[PDB]
Amino acid sequence: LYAPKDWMLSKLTGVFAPRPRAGPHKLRECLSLLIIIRNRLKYALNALEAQMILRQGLVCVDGKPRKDGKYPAGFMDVVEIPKTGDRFRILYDVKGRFALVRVSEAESSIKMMKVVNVYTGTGRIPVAVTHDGHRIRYPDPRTSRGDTLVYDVKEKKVLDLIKIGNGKVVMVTGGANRGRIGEIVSIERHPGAFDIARLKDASGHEFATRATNIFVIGKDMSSVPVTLPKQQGLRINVIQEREEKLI
Amino acid sequence: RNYNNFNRVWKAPRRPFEKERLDREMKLCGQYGLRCKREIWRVNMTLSKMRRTARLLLTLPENHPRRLLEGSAIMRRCHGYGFLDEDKDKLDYVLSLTVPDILERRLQTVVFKHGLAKSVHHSRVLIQQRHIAVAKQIVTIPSFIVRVSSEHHIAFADASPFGNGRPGRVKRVKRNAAKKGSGGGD
Amino acid sequence: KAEVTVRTSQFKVNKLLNRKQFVVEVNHPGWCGTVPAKLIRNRLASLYKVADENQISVFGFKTKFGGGKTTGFGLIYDDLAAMKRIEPNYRKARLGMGKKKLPARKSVKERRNRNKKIRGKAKGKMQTKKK
RNA sequence: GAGGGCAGCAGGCGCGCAAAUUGCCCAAUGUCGAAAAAAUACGAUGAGGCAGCGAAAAGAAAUAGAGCCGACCGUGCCCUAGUGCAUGGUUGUUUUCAAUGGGGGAUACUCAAACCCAUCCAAUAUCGAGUAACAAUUGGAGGACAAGUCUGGUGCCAGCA
RNA sequence: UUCCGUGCGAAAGCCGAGCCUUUUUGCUCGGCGUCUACUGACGAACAACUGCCCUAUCAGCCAGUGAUGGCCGUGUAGUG
RNA sequence: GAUCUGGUUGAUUCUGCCAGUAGUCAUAUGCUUGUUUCAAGGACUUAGCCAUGCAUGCCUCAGAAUCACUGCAUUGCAGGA
């Protein structure tokens, strides 16, 4: 199996699913495309229709319209499917779960990506590498891992990186608090445990998960003009939900 | 390699010839006019299981979740279904319960109770040669339990000759009219 | 002598496929003189007010015990082209419109057992275990 | 001279207490490959999937209803009780009209294929139950552990435990 | 100071189109091919702390060298 | 089901073990099977032996006439040995 559970696959069949590919947005924190073609948009339903997508290539992704279904989609990717011209972004809703989240074409005309690493390049060149598959030459002179960065997507253009710290609007992307959202309350250095992360959610209920899983997304709610998952990540009283449900 | 979640469920009941045990069980079985002790076992199991759950649940340090969740769930269906009651709501009867409560909510029996049929047996057999609607199917399975609005539903297979604007070659056994038309036929 | 009718319900529109997916609620008892296959399809064509009466795919049954019963699921095609591409030929056949490759339970699957090691020549019908 | 290696899969034998098919198919699933001029429909697949085999297992279940008589017990009372009546429950070769699926078939309707049900319409489906049928097992009857008071056998035997 | 993998940097193959040219040659433009280094995934190799089942009429085991370690180099994909 | 009961005495109260008892849906086997729904299924013994049979390939529009062959009147994209 090794099914990846937040890909919401199920029951019978899919020993493997169609396995993803080596190529940015790592195995476990991907949400690769195929699943989308068949299992998300739904028109294409068989493998036959997928197959059909491909033998008539079709499917299209910002940046490269992308050829690979096995290619991970993950945080913020922008799909346009020109037959109907429909766009979605990749993003969690609360209760941790990933949606393909339809987004404005114009909103669907940028994205944000965390820096995973910040390097020299050969010649007082610097180059930064993002936690999702960018290497970018000559970035801010002092950018750093864990600061995210706005990208044009339509173009090759950084629109930002934001001189990070404490108290900044965060989407918690994993550990326990996957799909939790919370402005950073703070991170204490916890060196080599990594900083651990005090988070407070839209309630103003505060919660912790380790600093690694923390996607700054802005200040003042969204700095980003990106989609905000309904509820915006507290996690609460199921019970009531049940209740709520039953009208 | 790869799987399936099938499984195996239910448990039989320990150690036979206990005169009372045999007696008590039977009597109950006598009320319903049955077809196996297995049906009892089934009930015991279930009965037990929730009763088990009950055993667990109450001791839970008060102000803690499950009791709320499950209590509501159990309450609302059972109660809902026409099993538990509003006053059986402090979970105290839930600890209690009786097998008959269950039997009583074998939909067949409720029917007979409902009136319909001349006994629970008469009720089995009816339903079974395909009669009286509630669901998608009559109740093909009188094995079933109730659920409080089926309560209403309980009526003909309009479908059945028994509610048809016409009948069918059966029960009534139109057939004879076919036999007539073929046999009698001038 | 009717008696007998096809109700539909829970129906969904799929633009991209150039085809439409949807539910069926069906009784019969009295009518007849009725029915074969085509009409079952037509009704769904013309339930959705689509004329091409063979731009229809139907499926939506199998059965078992659970008696008499008649709930399906139905599909409606934009074009015969869309069909010609969405429908596989045994299905297409189920309508009637073409066949797929020749089966023979790996009859010459045998060439495949021969071929990776061997160059040129061969010259059609070249052959191994089957003597 | 040459030359083989199923702890794949089905097959075989073998062993042993001991375990199914040289079946379909290549849909879905995966998976791989090239990546539907599909302008010529069209890779490839004993993985897989379908069946076949398959009482280890889990799901649900069949011998039907009712009445009349017989007849019965069981109450209430007449009545002594009883017949009776009444008050009830229940038997049966009686009796019977009456219940009625199995089970199989118009079949429209499935399935990769093949396949496992059928609306019960139309000669507005034919057909199909009261019986040894259209069927009951298995294991007990000192006790533990349910259940003979003994019919017959038997005779420390047979044999039981 | 130096080098028997780069000096991908184009003497090779589509579809698409321009204009010349008739069109072609030529000359254009457009989307793909052969194509090296660095990163990333990806993955694989390599390693500890922690944790594992029987048994003393099993107790000492353990050091030709590799046993434990220490030295230079080897040697390997690297550590040793 | 948070029980046992059966079995040592002249009784008696005893320590106390066997017998039973409940599962195992674990293997074999015996018996005996209405449907029918839901089903694992040559590990185990010998990783014993194996006929057999069958179980990696594939190209697009996008690397290669070859005069085979095929295609079509012919071209001929194509196809293609």
Care to describe what's here?
The structure is cut from a larger assembly and holds chains A (247 residues), B (186 residues) and C (131 residues). Chain A is built from 3 helices and 14 strands. In chain A, the strands form 4 sheets. A 5-stranded antiparallel sheet of chain A has the order 13-12-11-10-14, with no helix packed on it. In chain A, strands 1-2-3 form a 3-stranded antiparallel sheet, with no helix packed on it. Chain A has a 3-stranded antiparallel sheet with strand order 4-8-9, with no helix packed on it. In chain A, a hairpin with a 5-residue loop joins strand 12 (196-200) and strand 13. Chain A is mainly beta. Chain A is globular, with a radius of gyration of 19 Å. In chain B, helix 6 crosses helix 7. Chain B has helices spanning 19-32, 38-57, 65-81, 92-96, 99-103, 107-114, 120-128, 150-153, 176-184. Chain B is elongated and about 85 Å long. With 131 residues, chain C is α+β, with helices and mostly antiparallel strands. Chain C contains 4 helices and 4 strands. Chain C has helices at 38-47, 80-86, 89-95, 109-115, and strands at 5-14, 19-27, 56-58, 71-77. Chain C has a 4-stranded antiparallel sheet. In chain C, a hairpin with a 4-residue loop joins strand 1 (5-14) and strand 2 (19-27). The chains are: A mainly beta (247), B mainly alpha (186), C alpha+beta (131). Chain A binds chain C through residues 41-44, 48-49, 52, 81, 83-84, and chain C through 14-17, 85-86, 88. Chain C binds 3 RNA strands through residues 1-4, 26-37, 39-40, 58-59, 61-70, 72, 84-85, 88-91, 98-103, 105-106, 109, 112-113, 115-116, 120-124, 129.
